[PDB]
């Protein structure tokens, strides 16, 4: 149990669900949430946040201290007839963030919505630095909902990244820990009921005389009953992704987090501009290269380096050097060269 759980049990904190009815406590809680959200999202205008939080159709789940002090909360607008809800804000005060209230708050919100209505899917426009939190809380960047369900209903947010989470029916997320632990305990007990690793077999009969020679694993009765095969033994050492998947994932997360790679986040639309495809015969963006990497089409790091260089070249080709597009492209080039230089392996691939 994390500190949040014990604080809740002992009454240190407490959750409240409040809407703009017009009472006294509701207004205080809503104003506190408004202040926190304004603090955490300085880019968006304050009037927009004030209008959204104080609306009569949105809800709000907040965590309130004993002397009526609000630490954090979430806002959402449920579309009851469409079987999905939109999350419009989320934040926790920086000073109190270290405690780890985010998981507990998300679990409470999911449980409340599950036990009060019949919604299934959550759609949100995640921030550029909350993607890790959202991913750890079950969300995914891939959308499995039809275009008709959520088009014209939710609102776009420039600089966001849409995500979707499908709740698992008839589970209690608050008690996820104990339930999952008991399931794991039963699985482990079942495995132990058959595992033969507890038997201390004597040394190999071939080695009993003091001579050590190669022995076929299948010859030994225990190993033979274990089903060991050379094919599986050699196969189990091959990771699913590429051996450099982790390092390239670090680099990709670093570049996506970087505010200098915003223009390349999504591809250019054919409707908005017509000459973009006519001028560039190899239009490349971060999404396309990421998908191709997922396909393992990039056999060598030279492929990724060339893809980045060609992205920069296309950006400079379609947009003039004087315009900020090409300057930002060159700055992002200086940035990925910085990151590569931080990697000794790829430092030698920079041309003169």
């Amino acid at each position: 149990e994390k500190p949040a759980v014990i604080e809740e049990r002992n009454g240190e904190i407490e959750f409240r669900v409040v809407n703009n009815d017009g009472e006294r406590e509701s207004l205080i809680i809503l104003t506190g949430l408004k202040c926190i959200f304004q603090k955490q999202l300085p880019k968006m205008p304050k009037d927009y946040i004030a209008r959204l939080v104080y609306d009569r159709t949105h809800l709000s789940i907040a965590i309130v201290k004993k002397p009526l002090e609000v630490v954090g909360g979430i806002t959402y607008r449920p579309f009851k007839n469409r079987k999905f809800a939109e999350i419009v804000f989320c934040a926790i005060s920086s000073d109190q963030q270290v405690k780890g209230y985010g998981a507990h708050l998300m679990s409470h919100l999911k449980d409340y919505v599950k036990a009060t209505t019949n919604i299934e899917h959550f759609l949100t426009y995640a921030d550029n630095y909350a993607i890790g939190y959202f991913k750890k809380q079950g969300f995914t960047k891939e959308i499995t909902l039809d275009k008709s369900v959520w088009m014209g209903y939710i609102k776009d947010y420039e600089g966001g990244t849409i995500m979707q989470c499908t709740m698992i029916p008839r589970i209690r997320y608050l008690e996820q820990g104990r339930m999952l632990l008991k399931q794991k305990e039963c699985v482990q007990a079942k495995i132990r009921a058959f595992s033969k690793s507890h038997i201390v077999h004597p040394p190999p009969k071939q080695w009993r005389n003091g001579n050590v020679t190669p022995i076929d694993p299948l010859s030994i009765d225990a190993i033979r009953e274990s089903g060991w095969s050379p094919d599986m033994d050699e196969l189990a050492r091959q990771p699913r992704h590429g051996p450099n998947y982790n390092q390239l994932l670090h680099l990709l997360n670093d570049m996506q987090n970087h505010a200098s790679s915003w223009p390349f986040l999504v591809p250019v639309n054919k409707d908005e501009v017509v000459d973009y495809y006519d001028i560039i015969k190899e239009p490349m963006d971060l999404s396309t290269m990421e998908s191709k990497l997922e396909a393992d089409q990039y056999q060598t790091p030279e492929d990724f380096i060339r893809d980045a260089k060609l992205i920069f070249d296309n950006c400079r080709k379609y947009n003039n050097e004087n315009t900020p597009y090409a300057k930002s492209a060159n700055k992002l080039e200086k940035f990925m060269w910085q990151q590569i230089r931080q990697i000794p392996e790829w430092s030698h691939l920079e041309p003169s």
Binding site: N20, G22, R24, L27, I28, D47, I49, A50, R51, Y54, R56, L68, Q137, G138, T140, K147, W150, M151, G152, Y153, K155, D156, C165, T166, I168, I171, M179, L180, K182, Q183, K184, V187, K190, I191, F194, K196, S197, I199, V200, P203, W207, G210, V212, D216, P217, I223, E225, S226, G227, D233, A236, R237, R240, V266, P267, D285, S291, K292, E294, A295
Partner: protein, 464 residues
């Protein structure tokens, strides 16, 4: 590495042995000394390991079905461990961690069927560990061969699989799909509202932490009440916005094209009248406003038509057809020097909806406010009767005009014959002989016969 797992490396060959069958030395002299099967097969020893007189344990990978025939113990354990780490629901990462090229859909369905949606509860499987039917049903070798074949086939397919299509630009909702700059039909909200500057007074409001009630008086402290009083006005502004929207939705004021076209089609005076009557829509529903406007238009059209007919009657025009002809000729003359309601009311055939009182006799307005055939005599060719030819046509009954046409006789001679026959019959109690009527008519025998039969059938005379 973000993964919280532990990587196990052999103490001789320095090769990962976490996901493979290995052998560990059980001698106390060796602590956490793991030997890979090749190491314990080739017998490469290091440190204090003695492969000659020290017992060893065999670490099995636990490769056999337990819950699902297509899934083994290792895959289920990885599933649950990822749920612990990646969280229960983030299916992509957990599926990748498990391995076996099980797409997120297959992993999701497997977990659902085995743990969430099953004939089972958080105590897994049927009853207890004592049930060992599935493990003995299929030998380990067969399952391993099937797994190897499936993995090889999937790897070959992926190598030969087509490249993924590049992601298109994300499908932005763009709620402005309505035919109006700044309207969101899916949310029923405008982008620029009635008093969009109403937030300018409450977008900087902050509240003292933990306050709300005076520690001494028990009443809200002055600053608190002043702050509260400036939220009531904001709520009232929101309510006014809502009422304005509610009025807008009714009457279909969101159809610019239809309303503009209908307004264009109308004439000048009707347009002025509608523009004058526009403001009162707020107090009525759709049907009431439609009835109001239609009544005004009907009154105007009736006035125009009555004036037109009064103008006609003074020029000696004695029929609607000639009236229209004269109007056309007057248009042509004034040039020398679809039809409107006023042009429909004066048509030779009146509209159906003008043949019954609008408000009935007892003062309650209506809810919807706004024959003897004479045979054709031989050698008789009927002649059409025209208002210009027949002077007194407008008096003959419908049952007699057909006879007049069929008999080739003008109205006034027919009336004179009727009068003479009536006098002759009445003089003698009303009974007369057929030759009597034949002589009285003073025409061909068939004509007099037919007129006499018509009269006797009518009942104004009796045959002797």
């Amino acid at each position: 590495s973000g993964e919280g797992g532990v990587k196990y490396i052999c103490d001789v060959c320095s090769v990962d042995i976490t996901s493979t069958v290995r052998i560990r030395c059980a001698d106390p002299a060796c602590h956490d000394y793991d030997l890979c099967v090749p190491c314990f097969a080739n017998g490469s020893s290091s440190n204090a390991h003695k492969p000659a007189t020290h017992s060893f344990r065999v670490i099995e990978q636990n490769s056999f079905p337990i819950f699902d025939p297509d899934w083994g113990a290792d895959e289920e354990l990885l599933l649950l461990e990822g749920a612990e780490i990646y969280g229960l629901g983030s299916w992509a990462d957990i599926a990748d961690h498990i391995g076996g090229y099980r797409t997120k859909d297959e992993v999701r369905d497997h977990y659902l069927k085995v743990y969430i949606e099953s004939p089972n509860f958080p105590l897994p499987e049927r009853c207890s560990p004592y049930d060992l039917e599935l493990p003995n049903s299929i030998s380990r070798e067969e399952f391993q061969a099937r797994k190897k074949r499936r993995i090889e086939e999937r790897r070959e397919a992926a190598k030969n699989a087509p490249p993924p299509q590049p992601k298109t630009k994300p499908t932005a909702s763009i709620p402005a799909c309505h035919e109006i700059q700044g309207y969101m039909p899916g949310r029923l909200e405008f982008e620029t509202e009635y008093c969009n500057e109403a937030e300018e007074a409450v977008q900087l409001m902050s509240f003292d932490p933990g306050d709300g009630i005076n520690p001494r008086t028990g009443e809200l402290e002055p600053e608190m009440e002043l702050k509260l009083t400036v939220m009531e006005i904001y709520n009232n502004r929101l309510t006014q916005r809502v009422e304005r929207k509610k009025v807008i939705f009714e009457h279909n004021l969101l159809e610019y094209r239809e309303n503009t076209k209908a307004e264009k089609k109308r004439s000048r005076e009707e347009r002025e009248l509608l523009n004058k009557a526009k403001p009162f829509a707020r107090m009525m529903n759709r049907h009431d406003f439609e009835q109001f406007c239609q009544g005004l238009i009907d009154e105007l059209n009736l006035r125009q038509a009555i004036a037109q007919l009064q103008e006609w009657r003074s020029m000696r025009i004695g029929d609607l057809k000639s009236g229209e002809k004269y109007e056309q000729e007057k248009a042509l003359r004034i040039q020398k020097s679809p039809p409107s309601g006023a042009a429909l009311l004066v048509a030779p055939e009146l509209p159906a909806r003008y043949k019954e009182p609008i408000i009935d006799a007892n003062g309650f307005p209506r809810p919807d406010a706004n024959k003897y055939v004479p045979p054709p005599v031989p050698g008789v060719q009927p002649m059409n009767l025209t208002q210009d030819n027949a002077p007194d046509l407008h008096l003959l009954t419908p049952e007699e005009i057909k006879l007049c046409e069929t008999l080739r006789i003008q109205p006034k001679p027919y009336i004179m014959i009727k009068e003479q026959i009536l006098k002759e019959a009445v003089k003698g109690n009303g009974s007369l002989k057929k030759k009597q009527a034949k002589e009285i008519c003073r025409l061909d025998s068939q004509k007099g016969g037919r007129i006499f039969d018509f009269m006797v059938n009518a009942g104004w005379v009796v045959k002797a």
